[PDB]
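Tokens for U1 small nuclear ribonucleoprotein A. Go.
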Amino acid sequence: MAPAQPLSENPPNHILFLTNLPEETNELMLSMLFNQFPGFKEVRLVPGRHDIAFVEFDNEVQAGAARDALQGFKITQNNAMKISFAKK
């Protein structure tokens, strides 16, 4: 219940890897959505999958900007997309 401990240290992180974002979605799509951000560094969305997104954004302000921009991509209409920072 909200402990006063130094829990987590990397956050906010600038690498968001996860899936749950398919539906003819693609690499130039996610590359332009990720492109929106000057942080546009790594974009991995392309196998038969078209549903596993690996986004490396120069910095977390821009990774956080992209993530906060599409922070609830209702694929949930079947599934709410899942993007998980490279928390380590």
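The CA atoms of residues 21 and 71 lie 12 Å apart.
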